[PDB]
């Protein structure tokens, strides 16, 4: 990556445009449950998980790792940090909305 890898013990992860990672179905199902979908009983909602699992970050945000190796997300614009991907809250609300729609 860049010549420095960490700033103040925090590793800042940078993704290239041509970088490619295809997650596993097991990971998609786990993310589905974490945003509130039952994958077995609610296949009609699973498109939200298949989109959300690889949701891009806004440019203000990077994935980071602390001195223990734990992943978090950092907003360089305002200095806020969070364990979740900043879009996960919105995917959880979309799941609720879409479950209602199909009912």
């Amino acid at each position, epitope marked *: *990556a*860049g*010549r*420095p*890898l*960490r700033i103040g*013990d925090q*590793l800042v*992860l*940078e*993704e290239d445009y041509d*970088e*490619t*990672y*295809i*997650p*596993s179905e*097991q*990971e998609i199902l786990e993310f589905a449950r974490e945003i509130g979908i039952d994958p077995i009983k609610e296949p009609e909602l699973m498109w939200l998980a298949r989109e959300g*699992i*690889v*949701a*891009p*970050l806004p440019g203000e945000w990077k*994935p980071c*790792q602390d*001195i*223990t*190796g734990d*992943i978090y997300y950092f907003n360089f614009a305002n200095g806020q940090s969070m364990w979740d*991907h900043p879009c996960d809250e919105h995917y959880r609300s979309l799941v609720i909305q879409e479950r209602a729609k199909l009912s």
Partner: nanobody
Amino acid sequence: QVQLQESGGGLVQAGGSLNLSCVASGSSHFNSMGWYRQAPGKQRDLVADISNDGVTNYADSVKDRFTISTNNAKNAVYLQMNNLKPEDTAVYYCNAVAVAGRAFSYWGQGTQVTVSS
């Protein structure tokens, strides 16, 4: 899926060397890799980072003694450890991260290192 598998630990005399290794599936190509260690009474702590293009970073306590490296496919991480000291005793862990918007972080199972005398 990634299934990180570590090796190379055990008991060693002070002043000796080890070469820890961690290997993943061939279809893995990691953005970032690193070794960590959890010493008695201490939480898990960085040892060394390496990026996909080979740049490294070390904890100050090991920089002049350890060498982290990866392979050409970026799915294996190695830690050469020279001039081992009793304070290097810890459970070592390898970490590997892929990124696709979200970060996907994987860990090996833990590698006991005990330096005696």
